[PDB]
Amino acid sequence: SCPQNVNISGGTFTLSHGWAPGSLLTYSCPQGLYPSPASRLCKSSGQWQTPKAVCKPVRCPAPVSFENGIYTPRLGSYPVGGNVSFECEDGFILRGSPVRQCRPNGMWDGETAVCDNGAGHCPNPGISLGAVRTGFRFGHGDKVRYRCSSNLVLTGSSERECQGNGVWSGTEPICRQPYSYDFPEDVAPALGTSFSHMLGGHLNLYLLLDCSQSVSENDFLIFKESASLMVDRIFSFEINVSVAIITFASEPKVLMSVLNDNSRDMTEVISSLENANYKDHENGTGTNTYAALNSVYLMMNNQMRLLGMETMAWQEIRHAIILLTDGKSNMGGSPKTAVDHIREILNINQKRNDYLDIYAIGVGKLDVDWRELNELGSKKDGERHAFILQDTKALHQVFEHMLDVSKLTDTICGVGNMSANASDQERTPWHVTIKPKSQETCRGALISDQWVLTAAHCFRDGNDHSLWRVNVGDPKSQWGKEFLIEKAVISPGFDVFAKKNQGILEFYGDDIALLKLAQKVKMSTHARPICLPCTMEANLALRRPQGSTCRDHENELLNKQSVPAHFVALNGSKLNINLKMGVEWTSCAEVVSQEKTMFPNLTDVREVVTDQFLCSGTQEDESPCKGESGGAVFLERRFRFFQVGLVSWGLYNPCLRKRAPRSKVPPPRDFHINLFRMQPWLRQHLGDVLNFLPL
Amino acid sequence: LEILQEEDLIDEDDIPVRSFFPENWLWRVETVDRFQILTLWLPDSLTTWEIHGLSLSKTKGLCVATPVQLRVFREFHLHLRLPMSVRRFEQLELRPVLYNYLDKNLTVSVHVSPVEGLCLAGGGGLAQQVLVPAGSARPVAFSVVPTAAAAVSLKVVARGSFEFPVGDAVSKVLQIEKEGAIHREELVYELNPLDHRGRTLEIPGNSDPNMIPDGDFNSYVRVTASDGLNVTLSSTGRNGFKSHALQLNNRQIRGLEEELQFSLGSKINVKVGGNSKGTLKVLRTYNVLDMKTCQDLQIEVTVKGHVEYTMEANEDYEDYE
Amino acid sequence: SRVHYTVCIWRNGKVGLSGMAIADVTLLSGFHALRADLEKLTSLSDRYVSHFETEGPHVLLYFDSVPTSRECVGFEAVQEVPVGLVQPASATLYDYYNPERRCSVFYGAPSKSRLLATLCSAEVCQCAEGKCPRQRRALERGLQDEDGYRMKFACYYPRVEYGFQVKVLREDSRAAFRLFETKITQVLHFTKDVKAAANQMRNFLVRASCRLRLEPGKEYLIMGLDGATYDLEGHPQYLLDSNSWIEEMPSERLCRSTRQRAACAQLNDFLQEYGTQGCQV
Amino acid sequence: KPRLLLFSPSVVHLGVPLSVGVQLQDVPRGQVVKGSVFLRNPSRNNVPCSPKVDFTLSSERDFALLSLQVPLKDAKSCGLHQLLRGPEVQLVAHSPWLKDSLSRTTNIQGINLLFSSRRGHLFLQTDQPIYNPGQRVRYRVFALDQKMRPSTDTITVMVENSHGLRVRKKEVYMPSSIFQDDFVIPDISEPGTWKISARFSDGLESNSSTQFEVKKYVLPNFEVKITPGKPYILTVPGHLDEMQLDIQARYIYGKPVQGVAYVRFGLLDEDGKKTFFRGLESQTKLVNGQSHISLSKAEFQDALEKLNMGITDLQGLRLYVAAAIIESPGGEMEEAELTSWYFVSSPFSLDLSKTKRHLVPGAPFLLQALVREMSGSPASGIPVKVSATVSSPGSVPEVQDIQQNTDGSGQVSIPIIIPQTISELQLSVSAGSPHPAIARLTVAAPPSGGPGFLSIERPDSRPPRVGDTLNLNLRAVGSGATFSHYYYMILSRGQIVFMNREPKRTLTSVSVFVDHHLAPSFYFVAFYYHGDHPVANSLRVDVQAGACEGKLELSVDGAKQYRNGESVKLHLETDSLALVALGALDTALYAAGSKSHKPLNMGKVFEAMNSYDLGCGPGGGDSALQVFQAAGLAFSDGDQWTLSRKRLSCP
Numbered sequence A: 001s002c003p004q005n006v007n008i009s010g011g012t013f014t015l016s017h018g019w020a021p022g023s024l025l026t027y028s029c030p031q032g033l034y035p036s037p038a039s040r041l042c043k044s045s046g047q048w049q050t051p052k053a054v055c056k057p058v059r060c061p062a063p064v065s066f067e068n069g070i071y072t073p074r075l076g077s078y079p080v081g082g083n084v085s086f087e088c089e090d091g092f093i094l095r096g097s098p099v100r101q102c103r104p105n106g107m108w109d110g111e112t113a114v115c116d117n118g119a120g121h122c123p124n125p126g127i128s129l130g131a132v133r134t135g136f137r138f139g140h141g142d143k144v145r146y147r148c149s150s151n152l153v154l155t156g157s158s159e160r161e162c163q164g165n166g167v168w169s170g171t172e173p174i175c176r177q178p179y180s181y182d183f184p185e186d187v188a189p190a191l192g193t194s195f196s197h198m199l200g201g202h203l204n205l206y207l208l209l210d211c212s213q214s215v216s217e218n219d220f221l222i223f224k225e226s227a228s229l230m231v232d233r234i235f236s237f238e239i240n241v242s243v244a245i246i247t248f249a250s251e252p253k254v255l256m257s258v259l260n261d262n263s264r265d266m267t268e269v270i271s272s273l274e275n276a277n278y279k280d281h282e283n284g285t286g287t288n289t290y291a292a293l294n295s296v297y298l299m300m301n302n303q304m305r306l307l308g309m310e311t312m313a314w315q316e317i318r319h320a321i322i323l324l325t326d327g328k329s330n331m332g333g334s335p336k337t338a339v340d341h342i343r344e345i346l347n348i349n350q351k352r353n354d355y356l357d358i359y360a361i362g363v364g365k366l367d368v369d370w371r372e373l374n375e376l377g378s379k380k381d382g383e384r385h386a387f388i389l390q391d392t393k394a395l396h397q398v399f400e401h402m403l404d405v406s407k408l409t410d411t412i413c414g415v416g417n418m419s420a421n422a423s424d425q426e427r428t429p430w431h432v433t434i435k436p437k438s439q440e441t442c443r444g445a446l447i448s449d450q451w452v453l454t455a456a457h458c459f460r461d462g463n464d465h466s467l468w469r470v471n472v473g474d475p476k477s478q479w480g481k482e483f484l485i486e487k488a489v490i491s492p493g494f495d496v497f498a499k500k501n502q503g504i505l506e507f508y509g510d511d512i513a514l515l516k517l518a519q520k521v522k523m524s525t526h527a528r529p530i531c532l533p534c535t536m537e538a539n540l541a542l543r544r545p546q547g548s549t550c551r552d553h554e555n556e557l558l559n560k561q562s563v564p565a566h567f568v569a570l571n572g573s574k575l576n577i578n579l580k581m582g583v584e585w586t587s588c589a590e591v592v593s594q595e596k597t598m599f600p601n602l603t604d605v606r607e608v609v610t611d612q613f614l615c616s617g618t619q620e621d622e623s624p625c626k627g628e629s630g631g632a633v634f635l636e637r638r639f640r641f642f643q644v645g646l647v648s649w650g651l652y653n654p655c656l657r658k659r660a661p662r663s664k665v666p667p668p669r670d671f672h673i674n675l676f677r678m679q680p681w682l683r684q685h686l687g688d689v690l691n692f693l694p695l
Numbered sequence B: 001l002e003i004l005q006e007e008d009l010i011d012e013d014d015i016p017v018r019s020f021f022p023e024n025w026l027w028r029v030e031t032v033d034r035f036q037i038l039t040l041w042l043p044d045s046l047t048t049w050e051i052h053g054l055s056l057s058k059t060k061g062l063c064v065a066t067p068v069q070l071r072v073f074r075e076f077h078l079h080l081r082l083p084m085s086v087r088r089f090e091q092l093e094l095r096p097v098l099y100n101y102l103d104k105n106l107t108v109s110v111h112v113s114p115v116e117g118l119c120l121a122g123g124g125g126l127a128q129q130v131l132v133p134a135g136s137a138r139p140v141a142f143s144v145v146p147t148a149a150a151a152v153s154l155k156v157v158a159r160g161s162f163e164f165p166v167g168d169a170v171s172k173v174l175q176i177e178k179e180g181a182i183h184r185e186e187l188v189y190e191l192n193p194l195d196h197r198g199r200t201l202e203i204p205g206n207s208d209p210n211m212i213p214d215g216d217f218n219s220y221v222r223v224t225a226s227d228g229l230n231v232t233l234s235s236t237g238r239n240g241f242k243s244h245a246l247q248l249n250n251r252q253i254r255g256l257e258e259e260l261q262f263s264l265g266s267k268i269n270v271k272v273g274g275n276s277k278g279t280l281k282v283l284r285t286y287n288v289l290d291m292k293t294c295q296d297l298q299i300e301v302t303v304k305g306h307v308e309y310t311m312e313a314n315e316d317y318e319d320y321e
Numbered sequence C: 001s002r003v004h005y006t007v008c009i010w011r012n013g014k015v016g017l018s019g020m021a022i023a024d025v026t027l028l029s030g031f032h033a034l035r036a037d038l039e040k041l042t043s044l045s046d047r048y049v050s051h052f053e054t055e056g057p058h059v060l061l062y063f064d065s066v067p068t069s070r071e072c073v074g075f076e077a078v079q080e081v082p083v084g085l086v087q088p089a090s091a092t093l094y095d096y097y098n099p100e101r102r103c104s105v106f107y108g109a110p111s112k113s114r115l116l117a118t119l120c121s122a123e124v125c126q127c128a129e130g131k132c133p134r135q136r137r138a139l140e141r142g143l144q145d146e147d148g149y150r151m152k153f154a155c156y157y158p159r160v161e162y163g164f165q166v167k168v169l170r171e172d173s174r175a176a177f178r179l180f181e182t183k184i185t186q187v188l189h190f191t192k193d194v195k196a197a198a199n200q201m202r203n204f205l206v207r208a209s210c211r212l213r214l215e216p217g218k219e220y221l222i223m224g225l226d227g228a229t230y231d232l233e234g235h236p237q238y239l240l241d242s243n244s245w246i247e248e249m250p251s252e253r254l255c256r257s258t259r260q261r262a263a264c265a266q267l268n269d270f271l272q273e274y275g276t277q278g279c280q281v
Numbered sequence D: 001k002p003r004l005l006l007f008s009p010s011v012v013h014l015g016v017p018l019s020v021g022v023q024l025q026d027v028p029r030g031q032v033v034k035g036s037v038f039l040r041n042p043s044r045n046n047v048p049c050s051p052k053v054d055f056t057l058s059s060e061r062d063f064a065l066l067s068l069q070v071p072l073k074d075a076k077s078c079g080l081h082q083l084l085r086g087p088e089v090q091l092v093a094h095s096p097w098l099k100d101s102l103s104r105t106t107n108i109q110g111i112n113l114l115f116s117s118r119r120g121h122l123f124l125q126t127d128q129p130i131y132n133p134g135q136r137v138r139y140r141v142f143a144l145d146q147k148m149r150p151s152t153d154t155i156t157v158m159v160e161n162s163h164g165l166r167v168r169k170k171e172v173y174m175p176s177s178i179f180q181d182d183f184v185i186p187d188i189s190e191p192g193t194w195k196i197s198a199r200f201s202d203g204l205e206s207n208s209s210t211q212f213e214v215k216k217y218v219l220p221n222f223e224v225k226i227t228p229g230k231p232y233i234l235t236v237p238g239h240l241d242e243m244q245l246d247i248q249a250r251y252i253y254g255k256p257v258q259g260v261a262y263v264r265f266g267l268l269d270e271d272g273k274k275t276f277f278r279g280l281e282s283q284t285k286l287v288n289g290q291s292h293i294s295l296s297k298a299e300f301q302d303a304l305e306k307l308n309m310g311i312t313d314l315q316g317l318r319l320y321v322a323a324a325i326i327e328s329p330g331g332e333m334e335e336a337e338l339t340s341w342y343f344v345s346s347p348f349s350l351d352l353s354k355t356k357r358h359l360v361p362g363a364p365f366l367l368q369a370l371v372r373e374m375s376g377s378p379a380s381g382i383p384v385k386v387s388a389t390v391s392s393p394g395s396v397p398e399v400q401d402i403q404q405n406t407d408g409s410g411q412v413s414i415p416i417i418i419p420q421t422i423s424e425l426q427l428s429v430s431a432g433s434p435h436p437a438i439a440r441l442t443v444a445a446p447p448s449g450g451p452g453f454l455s456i457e458r459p460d461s462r463p464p465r466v467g468d469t470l471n472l473n474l475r476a477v478g479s480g481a482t483f484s485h486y487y488y489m490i491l492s493r494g495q496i497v498f499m500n501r502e503p504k505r506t507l508t509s510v511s512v513f514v515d516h517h518l519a520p521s522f523y524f525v526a527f528y529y530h531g532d533h534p535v536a537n538s539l540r541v542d543v544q545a546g547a548c549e550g551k552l553e554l555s556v557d558g559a560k561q562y563r564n565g566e567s568v569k570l571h572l573e574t575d576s577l578a579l580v581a582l583g584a585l586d587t588a589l590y591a592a593g594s595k596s597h598k599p600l601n602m603g604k605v606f607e608a609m610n611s612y613d614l615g616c617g618p619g620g621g622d623s624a625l626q627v628f629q630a631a632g633l634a635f636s637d638g639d640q641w642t643l644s645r646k647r648l649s650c651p
């Protein structure tokens, strides 16, 4: 028999078939340590073959390069419990967590630290710890290539390109170790958010389970349990969804079909899943993942034939695929080819990318590789799709809290239609019209089912809100539906004549007002609130971790020195602006010293334009009119809309459907109240409505 | 016959690598209220840092301080100098040099961490054995053929014996340029906006048979203000339609020949204005296969005899498997 | 023990040069030049070198006259430690007046090659350096299969991502590799190269320095690691190294022999079970 | 008889105050004057480009300095932006007094001045002296006004590449007087010397620029320095000194390098064409990091015979030494060039710029010389022999021989006595023995029959310190004491700073307090009046030992022996709230650079003070107009006025 001197230092070991030849020895070490070697081979009664054994400590990737900054302390590879601080040079604003304590799983915590000056068209993608980047140009259409260092394996996008919409193609690469794994608590929010986007029409869901000899009967039972809870949850949301169950082996066997109408009923799908057994899989105990993906491909091309080439009923069909596999594809070829076929056949591109998400949940500890899960799963910015959990217990744990979406809170926001054939209101459902007693018209934005955020200057006649009216979008008529107002809260710091003693006729500081409607708005395709940043709602809309802060939302949404934004015109059309931040903000707002009517006695530019204002209007930018004041200044990220400001005042009014610029003194210039500088006031008057992040 | 020590060396895990090699640091500007202390972290590079210093105060004008020489020395290090130019698929020889300034004999194992994209000798896992006499230096040669086509992080390590616990590790990112050499394609067009025929001009697109895929196509325009051109370049491009307008004269004449980075794929157009005899030079750079051993000098070294390997570098059958 | 070097120099331009030249050869990893031989060289009237300096793996010679013809000199060195790894060294020649007019040569070991053996085809190369293919022989030697050694090599370590039984059509030598163009009898396993099928051509290349022999007209079972060379024709071209299983397929007469019936039959049993069913894991 | 004097700098700078001196003479005791002074346009139109400033004087107070302001808006509106040909402006004093007293046709008395928009001090420094292609470049500029106080005026920076084309331009405001900025060099940029320029937005001519070198290279590990035994080579036919070099090479971190040195000799001329010696190349093994080689007698003679060159013609050429040391066994290459070696006929050089010209007859001649070692530091204790030949005043010329050693830093002040009615004076200054340095100068004499003369005597020839009071003596020569006082003014940075009157006495003295801002060179100008003919003399005084108005001290705790990665407690000491700007530079950058760029130090700042000085020589002149022109002022007394200077250079 094999020799018994196979003890590991600081850990235990297990055997499959005793000391008989051909038995596999498994090495286990406590958390924060890794087995080395992981497993041994008893040979043909020979010496214990290995691909002295010691539980070497977990050691964690160190920053190979940190552009435009410094990092302390500097070490070859940080140990468990260690900390690293990332503060960088002047003129550069930090993103991500400045302090990262590396967890016992071989990963750091928080988003990767990088500071960008914003001059580049796209935000700085940064160098993830343990990785390198090639190409230091962030212009539109340029590319960056990432390469791991030492013995790390790359999970993520090995190549990212700066797209037109200001978001790099693919996910953020993260160099990982062969022995690193993921905690259920870390990955549950990622899965929850990604599925929330898959839900954001009818959705098609495919569940792929593993039943080879490598996966045990109990492990397959836990796979079945996790799939059943997942299916139970997806049907509890009352969404148009069909789920299919495929359990693959050396040859794939389909247990449920989406062609069959039966997939939309919970009892039937759970009964079909429970009828699965390991026995019907002993006829071939391989892992042919390409075969299962080809089965999905045949499934959807049958759906393609039966629905039609061009019919709307299929175009709104989104696909999400889950794989609960041990990542040991050993037959049928590379699984990536079938994913290539799927991408080719759904016509996936930079726009239809939302219609296809692949989740590659690996399970196990000894035959799990990273490359297959990374390649198989999809790669999208701000999300993670390739995971591994050491045990199936962890799989059940992460799934049972995977959709932890707070019950009855609701308050969705920032959902619109981006089709040109859609109506103006349906494209911008937050947009409302405000009628004060002065008979002049202003705009506003729905921030909830009851509250509207607008500009204070729109109400010059006083504070008698009972004579004011609002019109929100309404499906039944383009005129909208008129509501009365229960109460009005104008910012106490607002006074257009506060600075008259210094020769400034009109000062728009604190030009913000919150209006409560008499009746709750019925949510529909013409009436939805816009996500007010720096809350749980916008955080879920932005695909970000739970522990995000308000400064984080500033850094992310207002992430460039020139950030494109939008406002709604009088006729309902969406116009284009660019917000100037940082250094360019000062040059943007300096043209107020050349005004001739508003400020005849103006010696300090900061006195009329403060930090409370965003600045826009250069280039070919559109200039809002007086009637458009109070409307939301919003930006689009990740197919959701976010209000970073609203129109306050401008140095040129084009409306003095019709518009006209000019080319003399003064050049057009506009200022909008930056919502991020008013956070205390919205928190005072809105804390019991939205759930605000820590500042 | 020669005695070799195996696995009685340092564990290679405690040795602190050196990665931060900035040519300059401490670029910040500070506000000092007659006294300030700075806790600055020394970079790993082994040179002397000449700390400059300038003062600007609202009451005492300007003062420039005397530079402070600061020395960093380790007494035993693996100094490595990457070649100035490394090309993909082209063979280079990294030269890590071990300086032993102690008063004792030291025997050290030097190896390069195996990394994807680098073709080393024997897979990169084999460690070269060298001995550095006290108060002297010894070089060790590593041959590498990089095929990564991108920047790659190598980590050369020296491991002393457990009897004498010394060692150094260096990890500098090695950038590899794309295959082939660079080629410059300058196109000169005299610019007379007075002649109406010269008001518009079309530059032919580049179709170079020898241009290498991923050619790093960069176009820089060189327009001379010698006499008020308003030359504007509009161009349809694969990335998009970008147009940059150049006003060289700026109603002023002090050496205002201009040069701007101007990013296109294939096609470019010119709109002219003003009154001058300026010159436009669009510069195109791309990779190309071309060659040049010297044509003037040549050298060839032949070796004959028996050399002994360490039984881990013999590429032959084990004869028992 | 002792190795005889030979450093040779000459010039061809005859115009661009400025006269004298500087020799800078670096010995192997574990060699230092002998000062006695160098001083004997420099003591001769027609020494061809006016000065020298030698410490450890670095040898300096000052050539004051580089002629058109091949005129040169060699010296002897000794070994301190065994060469830790197989690799070519470099010898450089500088110009005395214009050192930037320098240009190096790479010289190999006494028996090894000049440059790092790498397999380039199309616009990619794979690092060909490594270990010799074993050419496993169990049936011909008569050793019975133990614990399914071939299956164990296929499924546990090194896991095999390509496996075919190939009939070697021809043997050729290209660059530093000996190419064995072959025809696919059957495809047991495959990860990449989805267009693998029988009666198809594949190029299998091994470094010429090794002694591995694939006799034409005979079938072998080939398994191992996948390569990314693409053969410049479209079909992936594989390289034979370590982690690659090479076995000779049974013939009409060697499997007939007595100590070989069980071994050959077990090998075909493996062939059918692995081609048809799979790793079973 | 009564007169009004107008004093102003010959060049007026826009946007900064202009100082105008005004003086009366032969004014009745009870009489008073009233008026205003301002600039105008140069006959194009008669709009005042400056707000009027009043000046009221009487007999007891007959002098006053007026801080006249010249705002940019008035200068633009009145038309200094619209002249033709050269820049010129008119400064005029208006008062009803001329018509009332002198019965002059006009109440206008003025001067012709040249207006220039250069103003303020602009300094800027880059990240490194030398960069690789494709590397990020950081830099910053500092904006200071005339008094180097921080300034908030807007500036526009620009970047010019190696060929000289603009690559960048940034128009930036100054909240903090410091503007940091970075840009990336193109990857395909060939080696060259780039340039960064910074100008004030409204100041067209106020361009200050620095240069950084771009070159393909890699960071060297060690540097080689060739230090000659003596920085001069004596080529006199009598003998030739030995030539020996000490080639040193050290690892930058301190230790010496073990290797070999390859040395190539040659003759390099002024133009730059170098002809090497075929043969005589020296190769040696470095011992203790140093190699001491020398050129023999017969070897060098044979080299010149091979080049068919003689010793006598070796004048102005240089012995070029090039070294290319190979580190062994490292194999690294490093090159060091020597080009400072000069073949000279004397080991000393005489600088006779400081000796004042056109000195007065009847007062001591102050001959000042600078005995500087040829291509070295100033020499001390080196005797100077000087022969003065006073040319025929009516009698035979006489020879005056004075000897005096240099007191220190090459300073020698030899006060030879000049007799009256001297026609002209010839001087022969010779310093050094043997092989002296010969310098000959000739000075004429003021025309005979002049209205008078003024002599300035400086008892202490040593340069004044900062904050050190300087006292001068003034003596009228060759005329009666009709006048009662004389008037003097102090010029620093091209502006009149001080004006005062001292009564006429015997062996008088005037004390000038050397303030810091007067450094490093201020003009003392003095004049009196003999009837209606002004006579003046202006002595130039240089202040050395310059130091900051404040102070900035950098210090590192403990000895300068650290190990990589540990902490440094850098110490910053100053005397006020300062925007201290720091920078850490690797020393290897200096070695890798082909030309060693000296870092910014107080020499350049103090030269920046001198860049605004309009002085023309060490002062002095035959006439009052010449003295005033050399000092850099414009004088109008109503009858005779100095013309505007032809050029700023004053050749």
Ligand SMILES: *[C@@H]1O[C@H](CO)[C@@H](O)[C@H](O)[C@H]1NC(C)=O
Residues within 6 Å of the ligand: B103, B104, B105, B133, B134
């Ligand atoms: C080091 O090696 C040298 C050369 O072999 C030898 O002479 C010396 O004794 C050794 N030991 C020390 C401490 O220098």
Ligand SMILES: *[C@@H]1O[C@H](CO)[C@@H](O)[C@H](O)[C@H]1NC(C)=O
Residues within 6 Å of the ligand: B228, B229, B230, B247, B273, B274, B275
């Ligand atoms: C160039 O364009 C400017 C734009 O302001 C225009 O005013 C000018 O006339 C143009 N230049 C010439 C020489 O016409």
Ligand SMILES: *[C@@H]1O[C@H](CO)[C@@H](O)[C@H](O)[C@H]1NC(C)=O
Residues within 6 Å of the ligand: B254, D205, D207, D208, D209
């Ligand atoms: C300013 O620019 C002029 C014109 O190019 C140049 O001659 C002069 O030297 C510059 N002044 C400086 C560098 O101080």
Ligand SMILES: [Mg+2]
Residues within 6 Å of the ligand: A212, A213, A214, A215, A285, A286, A287, A326, A328, C281
């Ligand atoms: Mg399996």
